[PDB]
Symmetry: D2
Subunit: 424 residues, 4 copies
């Protein structure tokens, strides 16, 4: 069996509670997290965190997405920072245990329409192969259309995360979310544009709506602010990070903490440590029930397979859900149901591998073996690659159950199969 | 379409509370799904004719009960032969062939403390004549079930033992009896004389709830349509009793004198069919599925894990059916325990398993007769296609419907581990 | 376990094993069913009223006394049979049997008199025979009219008009007997005092296999509206000739109570059968078992969630009183009422505690039998000089009568519901009292 | 609608979050009490008047600093500032005085025995007992308060691993708990403090005992006029977690913006209280609160249920010790619990319970006890109207007892205002 020790870890006594109040009462500081940290960390790369050596430490500490703030620096300065990130990421390619994709995100300076500087910076993003754009001061759907148009003929695959920073963005949230790939709760400007005491309402509302829509949401700004000068955060800062994860944020961010502060690596380590504790404290019993009840009926096989796979994973306490994905969409649809099981996404797309860091609980594995002549063999090889990577990384052991999600034919858009495999 | 969402009590199904679900039940919302609660009809003088048996099979009889409290072995052997002749008369059309189980209902212990000598002889007769199920009378403890099992011998290991709970001791030792039985029958005739009549509904509801929780079949029996022994139409209490047995969670409903000796055996079957179909649509699946999942323990059995994933997937897309390949019936039983609204179409080569799965609510057995294809994946596909073609012919499926297909990774029982979303073409 | 541990130590484990209390404490409806226990004996007084049809087999004063003792709360007179003279004599016999127990509130049981109309026959509305029978009802002081074949709101307006100025206090229970009555249910319920699910005609007018849907829907809507609903016809049919009912019949009675019926009815079983008293005893025995098996935890939660917010102090006090009663496992809720309305508003929340309704109105005492769990106590003392003393005396009468009848025991907690000024409509006070 | 009522009507917690609206203005009075530490930056009578107007309900004196003479002068200044508003009885706001002990350091220390004696002699209402790690620590504090300090509330500060592990035994003998996050965040891993906070708040809510969230809630406001985004989030989340009180330490004791820090906690708490998902919270609290034969417990749940049914503007309760108001507060009604008491100490102490608004009764007594009760209820109504809690046409729930003295609450009445 699994043993009594298994059921005492990862807040499992609080997970089995019949009410949210009982769940809180059962949270235990001695119940150690076991699962891999699922909330991605976005770290802003600037003066304090640009060197290849420092970037290697940031990657080891847990950085998944490197943010470049185009309100500062120049194209040349940010191109060097991007090259340093890619050099630091590729320095781990000689070890499957440490190699991890890192997304590159361009955060625009901001705005009548798109500013001339934003057009040029978005063009720089396309030319430098950025994965994500954090679009500043998105106030309406037409702002997203303008950013999308500026990403032009080569950059349509770039994810647009709309930053909600003012009253209009909050009021027109639904129309903005509908055309965006995701949202950033940009609390710095939001806290100056609307009363500071109302920011938590906008944050909780936007995270809730993104969770309902199945689109990534980032919580940003001043999460560990005091760590710009101090080696340890305040009690409010650790609480803020934990509560952003409990609210439902897919990603958490560091700005000045990593861009210009004295402890960039420590700030990343702190977000990693808190997120892991907070993820185990999520009350999945209610969350899954509510996500299922609110999500409409669907005839899309990927969506149908995803909910079946997440339900199967909860039934057996599956160590992982291994999914084959070319665009990341099948992994994103699993992530929207918030499984406790890690979603190991095996993909040949380096871009999709970097971009799926936007979805909570997705662990991308970039697959580079040449395609097998028999498609069923190529699928089996990728599933075994996910399993062997999971064993090497500590997600899986022999005797564990894993859920495996695939499609009936090659190419994106055909996911329709869920299998239950015993790890051998 | 909007027409789809007005049928099968779908407005009541979408209600946020059980009270609002009741308020939204509509007599004009027609049932669409195939009737999922199996009908057990007792064989007797009113229903022994081969031609009458053909009408009973067409009316909806799924299990033929042989009551060994009446008649000799020669009588029951002729009943079995007539049942098999009527059932096999439809085998020439494999896409519409309906398996029918044969169940032997024992006389019981009488004044004795356990298995009677007549029950030993009757059980051996059952094994020799290939009966599918034993309804063991007056089961009072786990050792009664062990004695029935021992009396079936080495050749009767595959026969299902449904323990009849008929007295206070059987109700009190219910958990130990259920643990060793394949299922239970709430034998209300004797139960209503052994305990106060006004307490039988408590024992019925409790046993049905516990069987639903255990994922084991439960039968509601006796006097369900009693007045139809002599009258062409049942009383208001009888139609209510049948509907409430289905709403309670009974996998099967039974007819005794109504089919064994009455003047309306076919009409009694038709009446149970009509009521069960209306009552199944009136089940509040939102609460039932939530409570079955919450109560069902965590499992590391891949068949069980695939079954809950498949049922969840079926609810997500309003799947017309879950097509499952099964050797023993177990993969279909594990789907049935989650009470999907989608029909569980069970494709099997085992004639016995096809008959026995009628014990599980919502399982529609299809007996596949073709010998195995040389390539196993082709053999699996042909059986899934047989499930689809049978489903289209019977009205379960249409082009454009979504179905969930449940199969395993290798031949042989015990390896179900795959769930697939398929569009019917 | 922790939510009941202190009360389990105080009241004892025997208390918590009775009246399906282990099933009552279950967290899900499925667990509640699994915990139903045939050895868990009912303790509470039977709350679902029994309507018995009085006819040839049950007309004698001697037999009527046995029927009252067996549990009959409402006597039904079926104007499809007999005559005005025949029914007047049955009514006089019922009143003689009822008044034979009038020497004390411990023995007195008010029994309502209900007139069930012949109906419109082939006509579009109120027939001439119904006009005459309704006038007979008013002249003979009937408490309730079971109006046959109500198909729309104008049918109940016609019955109301035929009762005249003297019959304004008579309750109109609309019988839903056909497809149109089911389809126009909401408009009919709005203008009626309650509904009868008249399954005999309903089962011939619509497919027999659909009657249970109409029954469950109408009971649910009446429970939501807080108006009485009667389940009727063939509940114990075989008892017309047999001393024991079938398994389907006992199931039907239990399920009508579990569905939420305020009343259950006997027709031929008491009007013409060989076992009228035994049929009443059987409905009494089944209804007490089924009432204990109600899953109050979900029922109360759903009645709260569905019932709209209210600014009516009687309604606000009623929900507070029912909540208080559940918190302490109160033996009873004693309520002072002039029209029965304050007791009806307590009854709509389905407390497990008996609602002891103290009233000076003999008619309201008979009519409140339509509401589940209301036990009417007719108070006959003239008003005290000080109104607050008169209120206190009526509460003490409820307490003393309750103790002498086993509803209350010394040490029990009782919830008392009263108002701030005389007259109907001013209930606004809830008090928790310890019985000494 | 106002006070997040569209989010309040949601059928799931997820839909409730989706319906939260920054334009839905709070209307209800701020329920979560603010504890402000009184020190060098907030000692003056003039500053204390501004702190009281800003929303300070409890003045904390940190006995780790200053001296008996320094703290006695702070206490006198607090009382002078509080009493400067007593000329208006319908609007008078009581303010509790809480003594926070220095702690055991390396049983009960000799400095704590002297400071606790000082507390009793100066009539403090509450003791925040530092580093409580077991039930015997609470017994020692109680013994040190002596026979004259029987009425002082002991709020045990949970500051280390042992206090968290022995939480149940500590809560059982304490009047309430303080999640003292400063030391807790150094004694256990910083990333685990939120788990201890949420667990302790949940258990206190279940026990119906006050819980205080403390330390670094608005830390940056010691030097900056506006807090960080994490600080406003922390305050809001402490309220959403279920904290009865929120605290300011350095922000008011030594910072440059003590009044602004109080105003910020007030503004956030009011917004967060309206964002509480009462539908789930009430259902869970009501389900978990044990069955009881105590008439005050029975009346309290009946009154809270009645208040929710009619959207009551307030529950007016007469209380001698504060207990009847505390039992109403444990069910977290949206309706303000207006507690009318003659006890000045109970009026100050009842600030520990969320949503209890104490009114100190100083009107002449009525000869007949029933008449006296009616005028205390009319006092609650008149004070409620003046303060904006009540308007003509509102419904209120009134909770009283059957005889004088504490422990006899057993009546709930539905009253229409004016
Ligand atoms: O990237 C730079 C940078 C690059 C080149 C030269 C100087 C700077 C610089 O000075 C810098 C940068 C970024 C940020 S931030 O932390 O991203 N930012 C603070 C909150 N608002 C939005 C997010 C800075 O705080 C910052 O000062
Ligand atoms: O009241 C009488 C009666 C009075 C005078 C003389 C003979 C009879 C008589 O014979 C009688 C009566 C009543 C019922 S019933 O059961 O209430 N009822 C049958 C049809 N309508 C619906 C319900 C009878 O079944 C019945 O036969
Ligand atoms: O998530 P996406 O982008 O739709 O990709 C899922 C696809 O991956 C697969 O599992 C494997 O496809 P490939 O062999 O083309 O990589 C498909 O069967 C499925 O349609
Ligand atoms: O329900 P059971 O008895 O476990 O049978 C399920 C089995 O049926 C199959 O789908 C098909 O097996 P066969 O080809 O042997 O019939 C297996 O893969 C699976 O293990
Ligand atoms: O239930 P009803 O008909 O509203 O009667 C309740 C009324 O009874 C009382 O308790 C007593 O009134 P009376 O003294 O007129 O009988 C009133 O205070 C209250 O308004
Ligand atoms: O909340 P507490 O301390 O129990 O006080 C409630 C008490 O207050 C009262 O309402 C009024 O009592 P007093 O007149 O003594 O102030 C009592 O009837 C009740 O017992
Ligand atoms: O731009 C941002 O990230 C902000 O304003 O918080
Ligand atoms: O044996 C039976 O079927 C019975 O007694 O009901
Ligand atoms: O009239 C009735 O009572 C019926 O039809 O059931
Ligand atoms: O003592 C305290 O308040 C702390 O450490 O947080
Ligand atoms: K920017
Ligand atoms: K038999
Ligand atoms: K009639
Ligand atoms: K201190
Ligand atoms: Mg900004
Ligand atoms: Mg029997
Ligand atoms: Mg009729
Ligand atoms: Mg400390």
């Amino acid at each position: 069996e699994l043993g009594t020790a298994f059921f005492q870890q990862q807040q499992l006594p609080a997970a089995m509670a019949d009410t949210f109040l009982e769940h809180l009462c059962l949270l235990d500081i001695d119940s150690e997290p076991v699962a891999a940290r699922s909330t991605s960390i976005i770290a802003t790369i600037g003066p304090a965190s640009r060197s290849v050596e420092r970037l290697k430490e940031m990657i080891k500490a847990g950085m998944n997405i490197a943010r470049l703030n185009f309100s500062h620096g120049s194209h040349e300065y940010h191109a060097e920072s991007i090259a340093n990130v890619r050099e630091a990421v590729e320095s781990f390619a000689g070890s499957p245990l440490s190699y991890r994709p890192v997304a590159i995100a361009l955060d625009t300076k901001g705005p009548p329409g798109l500013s001339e500087q934003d057009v040029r910076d978005l063009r720089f993003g396309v030319e430098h192969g950025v994965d994500i754009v954090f679009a500043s001061f998105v106030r309406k759907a037409s702002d997203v259309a303008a950013v999308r148009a500026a990403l032009g003929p080569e950059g349509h695959g770039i994810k647009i995360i709309s930053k909600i920073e003012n009253h209009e963005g909050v009021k027109r949230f639904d129309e903005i979310l509908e055309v965006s790939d995701g949202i950033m709760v940009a609390r710095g400007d939001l806290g100056i544009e609307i009363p500071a005491e109302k920011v938590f309402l906008a944050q909780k509302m936007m995270i809730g709506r993104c969770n309902l829509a199945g689109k990534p949401v980032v919580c940003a700004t001043q999460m560990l602010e005091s760590m710009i000068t101090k080696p340890r955060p305040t009690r409010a800062e650790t609480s803020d990070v934990a509560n952003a994860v409990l609210d439902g944020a897919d990603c958490i961010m560091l700005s000045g903490e990593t861009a210009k502060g004295n402890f960039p690596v420590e700030a990343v380590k702190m977000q990693h440590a808190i997120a892991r504790e907070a993820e185990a404290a999520v009350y999945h019993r209610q969350l899954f029930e509510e996500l299922r009840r609110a999500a409409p009926l669907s005839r899309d096989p990927t969506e149908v397979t995803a909910i079946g796979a997440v339900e199967a994973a909860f039934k057996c306490c599956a160590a992982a859900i291994i999914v084959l994905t070319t665009t990341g969409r099948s992994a994103q649809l699993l992530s929207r149901y918030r499984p406790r099981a890690a979603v190991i996404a095996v993909t040949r797309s380096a871009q999709a591998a970097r971009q799926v860091h936007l979805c909570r609980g997705v662990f991308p594995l970039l697959y580079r073996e040449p395609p097998e002549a028999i498609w069923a063999d190529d699928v089996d090889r990728r599933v075994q690659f996910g399993i062997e990577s999971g064993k090497l990384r500590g997600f899986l052991r022999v005797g564990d159950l894993v859920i495996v999600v695939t499609g009936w034919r090659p190419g994106s858009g055909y996911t329709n199969i869920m299998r239950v495999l015993s790890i051998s």
